[PDB]
Design a protein around this ligand. Structure first.
Ligand SMILES: O[C@@H](CC1c2ccccc2Sc2ccccc21)CN1CCCC1
Ligand SMILES: O[C@@H](CC1c2ccccc2Sc2ccccc21)CN1CCCC1
Ligand SMILES: *[C@@H]1O[C@H](CO)[C@@H](O)[C@H](O)[C@H]1NC(C)=O
Length: 334
Protein backbone atom coordinates (compact mmCIF):
# COMPACT_ATOMS: atom_id res chain seq x y z
CA UNK A 1 0.00 0.00 0.00
CA UNK A 2 1.54 3.23 -1.33
CA UNK A 3 -0.24 6.48 -0.32
CA UNK A 4 0.80 9.62 -2.26
CA UNK A 5 1.60 11.99 0.70
CA UNK A 6 5.46 11.68 0.62
CA UNK A 7 7.81 14.67 0.32
CA UNK A 8 11.52 13.64 0.63
CA UNK A 9 14.60 16.00 0.60
CA UNK A 10 18.30 15.61 -0.29
CA UNK A 11 20.78 18.10 1.31
CA UNK A 12 23.29 19.46 -1.22
CA UNK A 13 26.92 20.53 -0.88
CA UNK A 14 27.99 23.76 -2.56
CA UNK A 15 31.48 23.49 -4.03
CA UNK A 16 32.63 27.02 -5.09
CA UNK A 17 29.22 28.04 -6.66
CA UNK A 18 29.88 25.61 -9.54
CA UNK A 19 29.10 22.10 -8.22
CA UNK A 20 26.05 21.19 -6.10
CA UNK A 21 26.04 17.56 -4.97
CA UNK A 22 24.13 15.24 -2.66
CA UNK A 23 24.23 11.66 -1.42
CA UNK A 24 22.70 8.53 -2.94
CA UNK A 25 23.08 4.94 -1.71
CA UNK A 26 23.43 2.05 -4.18
CA UNK A 27 23.03 -1.66 -3.28
CA UNK A 28 22.49 -3.85 -0.20
CA UNK A 29 24.10 -2.78 2.14
CA UNK A 30 24.12 0.81 0.63
CA UNK A 31 27.30 2.15 -0.96
CA UNK A 32 27.16 5.98 -0.80
CA UNK A 33 28.05 8.30 -3.68
CA UNK A 34 28.19 12.12 -4.10
CA UNK A 35 26.05 12.90 -7.21
CA UNK A 36 24.98 15.98 -9.17
CA UNK A 37 21.16 15.94 -9.82
CA UNK A 38 21.04 17.08 -13.47
CA UNK A 39 17.88 18.13 -15.40
CA UNK A 40 19.92 18.36 -18.60
CA UNK A 41 20.44 14.56 -18.71
CA UNK A 42 18.45 11.35 -18.03
CA UNK A 43 20.95 8.60 -17.06
CA UNK A 44 22.22 7.57 -13.61
CA UNK A 45 25.97 6.67 -13.47
CA UNK A 46 28.66 6.18 -10.78
CA UNK A 47 32.32 5.02 -11.18
CA UNK A 48 32.71 1.22 -11.26
CA UNK A 49 35.13 -0.92 -9.15
CA UNK A 50 36.05 -2.34 -12.64
CA UNK A 51 37.51 1.10 -13.53
CA UNK A 52 41.23 0.73 -14.51
CA UNK A 53 42.49 8.05 -14.51
CA UNK A 54 39.90 10.18 -12.65
CA UNK A 55 38.65 6.92 -10.90
CA UNK A 56 41.47 7.18 -8.37
CA UNK A 57 39.90 10.24 -6.68
CA UNK A 58 36.31 8.87 -6.54
CA UNK A 59 34.24 6.25 -4.76
CA UNK A 60 33.68 3.11 -6.86
CA UNK A 61 30.66 0.83 -6.89
CA UNK A 62 31.52 -2.79 -6.23
CA UNK A 63 28.72 -5.09 -7.50
CA UNK A 64 30.42 -8.02 -5.67
CA UNK A 65 29.48 -6.33 -2.31
CA UNK A 66 25.75 -6.03 -3.17
CA UNK A 67 23.18 -8.79 -2.60
CA UNK A 68 20.47 -6.83 -4.54
CA UNK A 69 22.60 -6.44 -7.74
CA UNK A 70 21.36 -7.83 -11.09
CA UNK A 71 23.83 -8.10 -13.97
CA UNK A 72 23.08 -6.69 -17.45
CA UNK A 73 26.43 -5.48 -18.87
CA UNK A 74 25.11 -3.67 -22.01
CA UNK A 75 27.82 -1.18 -23.12
CA UNK A 76 26.97 2.51 -22.59
CA UNK A 77 28.60 5.88 -23.51
CA UNK A 78 27.50 9.23 -22.02
CA UNK A 79 28.43 12.52 -23.74
CA UNK A 80 28.34 15.76 -21.64
CA UNK A 81 29.34 19.36 -22.63
CA UNK A 82 32.48 18.97 -20.44
CA UNK A 83 33.42 15.32 -21.08
CA UNK A 84 32.49 11.72 -22.02
CA UNK A 85 32.18 8.69 -19.65
CA UNK A 86 31.83 5.03 -20.68
CA UNK A 87 30.87 1.80 -19.00
CA UNK A 88 28.12 -0.80 -18.86
CA UNK A 89 24.57 -1.24 -17.41
CA UNK A 90 23.82 -2.61 -13.99
CA UNK A 91 20.63 -2.79 -11.92
CA UNK A 92 20.44 -2.30 -8.18
CA UNK A 93 18.37 -0.60 -5.49
CA UNK A 94 19.05 3.14 -5.24
CA UNK A 95 18.20 5.07 -2.06
CA UNK A 96 17.59 8.82 -2.58
CA UNK A 97 16.52 10.76 0.52
CA UNK A 98 14.53 7.87 1.99
CA UNK A 99 12.88 6.75 -1.28
CA UNK A 100 14.20 3.30 -2.46
CA UNK A 101 13.96 2.48 -6.21
CA UNK A 102 15.07 -0.48 -8.36
CA UNK A 103 17.18 1.32 -10.97
CA UNK A 104 19.17 0.51 -14.11
CA UNK A 105 22.32 2.66 -13.98
CA UNK A 106 25.76 3.01 -15.55
CA UNK A 107 28.89 1.49 -13.97
CA UNK A 108 31.57 3.83 -15.42
CA UNK A 109 34.89 2.18 -16.36
CA UNK A 110 36.26 4.99 -18.57
CA UNK A 111 36.47 8.30 -16.64
CA UNK A 112 39.12 10.68 -18.16
CA UNK A 113 41.28 12.78 -15.78
CA UNK A 114 40.10 15.82 -17.74
CA UNK A 115 37.54 17.02 -16.71
CA UNK A 116 36.64 14.33 -14.07
CA UNK A 117 39.66 14.99 -11.78
CA UNK A 118 37.99 18.43 -11.24
CA UNK A 119 34.65 16.80 -10.22
CA UNK A 120 34.06 16.78 -6.41
CA UNK A 121 31.07 14.46 -7.01
CA UNK A 122 31.36 10.73 -7.94
CA UNK A 123 28.54 10.43 -10.50
CA UNK A 124 25.38 11.92 -12.04
CA UNK A 125 21.62 11.39 -11.41
CA UNK A 126 19.95 12.55 -14.63
CA UNK A 127 16.63 14.25 -13.77
CA UNK A 128 15.55 14.59 -17.45
CA UNK A 129 12.98 12.57 -19.50
CA UNK A 130 13.21 9.05 -21.12
CA UNK A 131 13.23 10.72 -24.62
CA UNK A 132 16.81 11.85 -23.79
CA UNK A 133 17.95 8.66 -21.92
CA UNK A 134 20.79 6.71 -23.59
CA UNK A 135 19.99 3.04 -24.16
CA UNK A 136 16.32 4.04 -23.59
CA UNK A 137 16.90 3.30 -19.82
CA UNK A 138 14.01 4.37 -17.50
CA UNK A 139 15.10 7.55 -15.60
CA UNK A 140 15.10 7.54 -11.76
CA UNK A 141 12.21 10.08 -11.44
CA UNK A 142 10.01 8.02 -13.85
CA UNK A 143 10.66 5.03 -11.51
CA UNK A 144 9.79 7.09 -8.37
CA UNK A 145 6.54 8.26 -10.15
CA UNK A 146 5.62 4.55 -10.88
CA UNK A 147 5.86 3.79 -7.11
CA UNK A 148 3.00 6.25 -6.44
CA UNK A 149 4.51 7.57 -3.16
CA UNK A 150 5.04 11.28 -3.95
CA UNK A 151 2.67 14.03 -2.78
CA UNK A 152 2.95 15.52 -6.31
CA UNK A 153 4.87 14.51 -9.50
CA UNK A 154 7.31 17.41 -9.04
CA UNK A 155 10.89 18.08 -7.84
CA UNK A 156 12.39 21.35 -6.84
CA UNK A 157 15.87 22.87 -6.48
CA UNK A 158 17.43 25.30 -4.00
CA UNK A 159 21.05 26.41 -4.70
CA UNK A 160 22.62 28.57 -2.04
CA UNK A 161 25.53 31.17 -2.36
CA UNK A 162 28.90 29.89 -0.92
CA UNK A 163 30.04 28.92 8.10
CA UNK A 164 27.58 26.01 8.97
CA UNK A 165 25.09 26.94 6.15
CA UNK A 166 23.17 24.58 3.81
CA UNK A 167 24.73 24.44 0.30
CA UNK A 168 21.42 23.52 -1.33
CA UNK A 169 18.47 21.13 -1.28
CA UNK A 170 16.37 18.98 -3.66
CA UNK A 171 12.76 18.22 -2.69
CA UNK A 172 11.14 15.19 -4.39
CA UNK A 173 7.36 15.51 -4.32
CA UNK A 174 7.15 19.24 -3.56
CA UNK A 175 8.87 22.60 -2.87
CA UNK A 176 10.32 23.93 0.40
CA UNK A 177 8.58 27.27 1.24
CA UNK A 178 11.47 28.10 3.59
CA UNK A 179 13.66 28.59 0.51
CA UNK A 180 11.51 30.88 -1.59
CA UNK A 181 9.58 34.20 -1.30
CA UNK A 182 6.20 34.97 -2.84
CA UNK A 183 4.62 32.71 -5.45
CA UNK A 184 5.74 30.55 -8.35
CA UNK A 185 5.32 31.72 -11.91
CA UNK A 186 5.02 28.85 -14.37
CA UNK A 187 6.15 28.49 -17.95
CA UNK A 188 5.01 25.51 -20.00
CA UNK A 189 7.62 23.34 -21.70
CA UNK A 190 7.74 23.78 -25.55
CA UNK A 191 7.45 19.97 -25.74
CA UNK A 192 7.70 17.07 -23.30
CA UNK A 193 11.06 15.18 -23.29
CA UNK A 194 13.24 18.22 -22.49
CA UNK A 195 13.24 20.76 -19.55
CA UNK A 196 13.23 23.59 -22.15
CA UNK A 197 11.06 26.75 -22.35
CA UNK A 198 10.66 29.63 -24.81
CA UNK A 199 12.63 32.81 -23.97
CA UNK A 200 11.26 36.14 -25.36
CA UNK A 201 14.35 38.24 -24.86
CA UNK A 202 17.67 38.95 -23.11
CA UNK A 203 18.23 42.51 -21.91
CA UNK A 204 21.41 44.33 -20.78
CA UNK A 205 20.13 47.09 -18.50
CA UNK A 206 17.77 49.20 -20.61
CA UNK A 207 18.15 47.69 -24.17
CA UNK A 208 16.97 44.14 -25.19
CA UNK A 209 19.99 43.25 -27.35
CA UNK A 210 19.60 39.48 -27.80
CA UNK A 211 16.91 36.84 -28.34
CA UNK A 212 14.74 39.58 -29.98
CA UNK A 213 12.74 37.15 -32.15
CA UNK A 214 12.63 34.58 -29.33
CA UNK A 215 14.84 31.64 -28.45
CA UNK A 216 15.07 28.57 -26.23
CA UNK A 217 16.12 28.18 -22.60
CA UNK A 218 17.11 24.84 -21.10
CA UNK A 219 16.68 24.87 -17.28
CA UNK A 220 19.82 22.89 -16.37
CA UNK A 221 20.61 22.03 -12.76
CA UNK A 222 23.89 20.38 -13.89
CA UNK A 223 25.19 23.53 -15.63
CA UNK A 224 27.34 25.79 -13.45
CA UNK A 225 26.60 28.92 -15.41
CA UNK A 226 24.27 30.75 -17.71
CA UNK A 227 25.33 29.82 -21.25
CA UNK A 228 24.36 30.98 -24.71
CA UNK A 229 25.65 30.22 -28.22
CA UNK A 230 29.21 31.48 -29.05
CA UNK A 231 27.55 34.14 -31.24
CA UNK A 232 25.15 35.31 -28.45
CA UNK A 233 27.88 35.36 -25.76
CA UNK A 234 30.38 37.37 -27.96
CA UNK A 235 27.67 40.09 -28.32
CA UNK A 236 26.69 39.98 -24.58
CA UNK A 237 30.33 40.19 -23.38
CA UNK A 238 30.96 43.16 -25.72
CA UNK A 239 27.90 44.93 -24.12
CA UNK A 240 29.37 44.17 -20.66
CA UNK A 241 32.92 45.26 -21.52
CA UNK A 242 34.20 41.77 -20.58
CA UNK A 243 37.30 40.29 -22.23
CA UNK A 244 37.97 36.72 -23.32
CA UNK A 245 40.65 34.75 -21.46
CA UNK A 246 41.43 31.06 -22.10
CA UNK A 247 38.50 29.26 -20.38
CA UNK A 248 36.52 32.31 -19.09
CA UNK A 249 35.43 35.98 -19.54
CA UNK A 250 36.79 38.60 -17.14
CA UNK A 251 36.25 42.24 -16.11
CA UNK A 252 38.50 44.44 -13.93
CA UNK A 253 37.47 43.66 -10.30
CA UNK A 254 36.84 47.38 -9.58
CA UNK A 255 34.40 47.55 -12.55
CA UNK A 256 32.48 44.47 -11.28
CA UNK A 257 29.77 46.23 -9.19
CA UNK A 258 29.24 48.86 -11.98
CA UNK A 259 28.13 46.09 -14.45
CA UNK A 260 24.52 46.36 -15.70
CA UNK A 261 21.55 44.03 -14.92
CA UNK A 262 20.92 41.03 -17.18
CA UNK A 263 17.23 40.19 -17.76
CA UNK A 264 15.68 37.00 -19.14
CA UNK A 265 12.09 37.36 -20.48
CA UNK A 266 10.35 34.04 -19.61
CA UNK A 267 6.58 33.61 -19.76
CA UNK A 268 4.92 36.64 -18.23
CA UNK A 269 8.02 38.16 -16.58
CA UNK A 270 11.59 39.41 -16.56
CA UNK A 271 14.05 37.47 -14.40
CA UNK A 272 16.83 39.88 -13.47
CA UNK A 273 20.41 39.13 -12.41
CA UNK A 274 22.37 42.08 -10.96
CA UNK A 275 26.23 42.17 -11.21
CA UNK A 276 26.32 40.57 -7.68
CA UNK A 277 24.55 37.45 -9.17
CA UNK A 278 27.01 36.94 -12.05
CA UNK A 279 30.45 38.27 -11.05
CA UNK A 280 32.82 36.21 -8.89
CA UNK A 281 33.84 39.31 -6.91
CA UNK A 282 37.00 37.82 -5.35
CA UNK A 283 38.63 41.31 -5.09
CA UNK A 284 37.74 44.98 -5.70
CA UNK A 285 41.22 45.89 -7.05
CA UNK A 286 41.65 47.74 -10.37
CA UNK A 287 44.81 45.63 -10.88
CA UNK A 288 42.99 42.24 -10.75
CA UNK A 289 40.68 40.33 -13.14
CA UNK A 290 37.27 39.02 -11.93
CA UNK A 291 35.48 36.04 -13.60
CA UNK A 292 31.85 36.06 -14.84
CA UNK A 293 29.40 33.20 -14.09
CA UNK A 294 28.44 33.28 -17.85
CA UNK A 295 30.05 31.37 -20.73
CA UNK A 296 29.43 30.00 -24.21
CA UNK A 297 28.18 26.46 -24.80
CA UNK A 298 27.10 25.31 -28.26
CA UNK A 299 24.39 22.80 -27.50
CA UNK A 300 23.91 20.51 -30.53
CA UNK A 301 20.50 19.53 -32.00
CA UNK A 302 17.81 18.22 -31.31
CA UNK A 303 18.02 20.20 -27.99
CA UNK A 304 20.28 23.06 -29.20
CA UNK A 305 20.94 25.80 -30.35
CA UNK A 306 19.81 26.99 -26.88
CA UNK A 307 20.61 29.05 -23.81
CA UNK A 308 21.06 27.11 -20.57
CA UNK A 309 20.04 28.53 -17.22
CA UNK A 310 22.39 26.85 -14.77
CA UNK A 311 23.38 27.38 -11.11
CA UNK A 312 23.95 31.16 -11.77
CA UNK A 313 20.20 31.56 -12.54
CA UNK A 314 18.98 28.87 -9.99
CA UNK A 315 20.78 30.57 -7.03
CA UNK A 316 18.55 33.64 -7.71
CA UNK A 317 15.33 31.69 -8.56
CA UNK A 318 14.20 28.57 -6.60
CA UNK A 319 13.06 26.16 -9.39
CA UNK A 320 10.19 23.61 -9.54
CA UNK A 321 10.06 20.94 -12.27
CA UNK A 322 6.48 19.78 -12.78
CA UNK A 323 6.14 16.41 -14.54
CA UNK A 324 2.31 16.24 -14.22
CA UNK A 325 1.70 19.61 -15.92
CA UNK A 326 4.92 19.72 -18.07
CA UNK A 327 5.92 23.10 -16.76
CA UNK A 328 8.67 24.88 -14.76
CA UNK A 329 8.01 27.31 -11.92
CA UNK A 330 10.28 30.06 -10.60
CA UNK A 331 10.13 31.88 -7.29
CA UNK A 332 12.69 34.26 -5.74
CA UNK A 333 15.08 32.11 -3.61
CA UNK A 334 15.29 32.98 0.16
O1 LIG B 1 36.13 25.80 -10.75
C1 LIG B 1 36.42 26.52 -11.96
C2 LIG B 1 36.27 25.59 -13.21
C3 LIG B 1 37.24 24.36 -13.31
C4 LIG B 1 36.71 23.36 -14.36
C5 LIG B 1 35.94 22.25 -13.94
C6 LIG B 1 35.44 21.33 -14.87
C7 LIG B 1 35.72 21.47 -16.23
C8 LIG B 1 36.50 22.55 -16.67
C9 LIG B 1 37.00 23.50 -15.75
S1 LIG B 1 38.01 24.83 -16.37
C10 LIG B 1 39.13 24.99 -14.99
C11 LIG B 1 40.48 25.34 -15.26
C12 LIG B 1 41.41 25.46 -14.21
C13 LIG B 1 40.99 25.23 -12.89
C14 LIG B 1 39.65 24.87 -12.61
C15 LIG B 1 38.70 24.76 -13.65
C16 LIG B 1 35.52 27.79 -12.06
N1 LIG B 1 35.88 28.99 -11.22
C17 LIG B 1 34.88 30.08 -11.19
C18 LIG B 1 34.32 30.15 -9.75
C19 LIG B 1 34.99 28.98 -9.02
C20 LIG B 1 36.31 28.88 -9.81
O1 LIG C 1 29.33 22.75 -15.43
C1 LIG C 1 30.37 21.86 -15.00
C2 LIG C 1 30.01 20.45 -15.51
C3 LIG C 1 30.01 19.39 -14.38
C4 LIG C 1 28.98 18.28 -14.75
C5 LIG C 1 27.65 18.37 -14.29
C6 LIG C 1 26.69 17.41 -14.65
C7 LIG C 1 27.03 16.33 -15.48
C8 LIG C 1 28.36 16.20 -15.92
C9 LIG C 1 29.32 17.18 -15.57
S1 LIG C 1 30.95 16.99 -16.20
C10 LIG C 1 31.94 17.79 -14.97
C11 LIG C 1 33.25 17.34 -14.79
C12 LIG C 1 34.07 17.96 -13.82
C13 LIG C 1 33.57 19.03 -13.05
C14 LIG C 1 32.27 19.49 -13.25
C15 LIG C 1 31.44 18.87 -14.19
C16 LIG C 1 31.75 22.29 -15.59
N1 LIG C 1 31.87 23.76 -15.79
C17 LIG C 1 32.81 24.51 -14.93
C18 LIG C 1 32.93 25.89 -15.61
C19 LIG C 1 31.96 25.80 -16.81
C20 LIG C 1 32.02 24.30 -17.15
C1 LIG D 1 19.69 -4.99 -20.30
O1 LIG D 1 18.51 -4.23 -20.00
C2 LIG D 1 17.66 -3.89 -21.12
C3 LIG D 1 16.49 -3.11 -20.56
O2 LIG D 1 16.85 -1.78 -20.20
C4 LIG D 1 17.24 -5.16 -21.84
O3 LIG D 1 16.45 -4.83 -22.98
C5 LIG D 1 18.46 -5.97 -22.25
O4 LIG D 1 18.05 -7.19 -22.86
C6 LIG D 1 19.33 -6.29 -21.03
N1 LIG D 1 20.53 -7.00 -21.42
C7 LIG D 1 21.01 -8.08 -20.78
C8 LIG D 1 22.21 -8.74 -21.40
O5 LIG D 1 20.50 -8.51 -19.74
Amino acid sequence: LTLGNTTSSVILTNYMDTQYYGEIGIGTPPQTFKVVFDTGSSNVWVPSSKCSTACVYHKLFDASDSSSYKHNGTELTLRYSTGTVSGFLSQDIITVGGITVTQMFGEVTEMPALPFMLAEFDGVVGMGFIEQAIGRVTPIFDNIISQGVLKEDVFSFYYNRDSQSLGGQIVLGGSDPQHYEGNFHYINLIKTGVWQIQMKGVSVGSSTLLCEDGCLALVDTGASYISGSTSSIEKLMEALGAKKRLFDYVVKCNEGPTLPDISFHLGGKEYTLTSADYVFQESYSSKKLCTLAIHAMDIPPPTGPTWALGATFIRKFYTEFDRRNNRIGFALAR
